[PDB]
Design a protein around this nucleic acid. Sequence first.
DNA 1: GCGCACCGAAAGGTGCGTATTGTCT
Length: 288
Amino acid sequence: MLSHMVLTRQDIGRAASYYEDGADDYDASEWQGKGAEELGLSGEVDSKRFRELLAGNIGEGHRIMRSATRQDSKERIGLDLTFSAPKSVSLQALVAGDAEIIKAHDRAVARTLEQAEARAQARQKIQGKTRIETTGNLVIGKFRHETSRERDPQLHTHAVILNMTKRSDGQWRALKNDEIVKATRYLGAVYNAELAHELQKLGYQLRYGKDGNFDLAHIDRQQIEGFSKRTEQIAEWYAARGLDPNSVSLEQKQAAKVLSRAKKTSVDREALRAEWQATAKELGIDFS
DNA sequence: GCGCACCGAAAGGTGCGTATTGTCT
Ligand code: NI
């Protein structure tokens, strides 16, 4: 699954909290992109530099970016592309404990982002005429997480693409995100294909469903739903309001997701894993 | 965006809208 969300000023607090969330059996933060190579960024994401970049401060001595933003409009700080694995894949990786599956997810994400980068663009005006240039470079902060809001195993990565890109003439500008945003479904299929390929190299058999999504063949739907509490909460909201999931409006969909949410409280990380294992036995899951 | 108005200073730049599957911010 792949979803996008344009980030604005009001989201600056959430964007930097991508450090606190998830889970810790684990390089869970990493830089990516030619634009990042350009600025001298590699390895772990330094939280201090990340905040400055979100604010439009490339550092080194040039001016704060994006001053051309209209005061009656919102300032954009980035674009979050969130990659999520199928439930069974999260289970095998975080409950049974297969570290090679974590790597399979990371590779799939990295390869998809390379194709999103090929779609990076910027604008440039010369004597009144505006032109769109395919830029090819991005600055990305990647944060891997391990739990859902209800604390079920949920392997995912928040790829935060910063609102900046370097043109042919050497000038840094805001990202024209059209091609990346409109290619979300296509990029989601790239992630699915690469993940599948990496899992098959490890020896797993896959079961394709109907949307073109897949789950490991040895884990069934009943067992999957037993580790999908949020999905259960969303389904109850629709039922209570008497709505048909096949035809709900966007407003109703967002309402079901947002309003059925409970508050995020912390957990004892070592104890949670043991709970998962006992729950898995209860559901009759054989990880063999 | 389906070329605009309004940002700051460059006969220059930006938001805006874009999206829509499930494991579910
Ligand atoms: Ni997360």
